[PDB]
């Protein structure tokens, strides 16, 4: 959803 984490 866009997070790289």
């Amino acid at each position, epitope marked *: *959803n*866009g*997070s*790289w*984490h």
Partner: antibody
Amino acid sequence: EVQLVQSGGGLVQPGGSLRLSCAASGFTFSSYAMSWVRQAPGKGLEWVSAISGSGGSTYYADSVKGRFTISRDNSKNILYLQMNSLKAEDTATYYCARAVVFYYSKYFDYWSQGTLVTVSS
Amino acid sequence: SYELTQLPSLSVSLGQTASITCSGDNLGDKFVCWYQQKPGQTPVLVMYEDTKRPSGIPERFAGSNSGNTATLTITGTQAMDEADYYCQTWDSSTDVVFGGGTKLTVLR
């Protein structure tokens, strides 16, 4: 169609600064993490930096941490890489890439054309 | 720092099967993807999540990731498959990690 068009590059002196940019279209830009990947002449691919979709989190390879800054403008659909304190070791073809992340699965599905950065006096 | 091992070169006869390997300790426990890079060109994703082919990639390309090695196989190798192939994964010690790349040479 997905497009990533890179700008910037060329010659820069050791210790100098250079900014690359990546213009995106054909997808919801803010929904994707983005990254910079580089390749020294005749060498392999090396991940450089990433930024989350929102711009809230940035990540850097140990080789560039503290010298580079990644940022993005979600209204203009542009990603930036400000490179400072450049070294001969940073000479490479740089690519911007769209990342798909599910932290276990990370991959780059679309890539820009590369731009060559030469660090020389 | 976590490392991915690829042989720098692999030779295959035209029309034969190429098996490009990528090894790493926890490899079978991780998700691996593959890129094809033709000389002086932008890399192209050819395989993701070990075995999934992006749209437009020929069925001749197949991926597997079992045990300590991830393998990209190419059947009926064509001159159009001549390229450098890179495997890539993730690890906590390096974030995104690439293999050194394997140059596929076609024997004629």
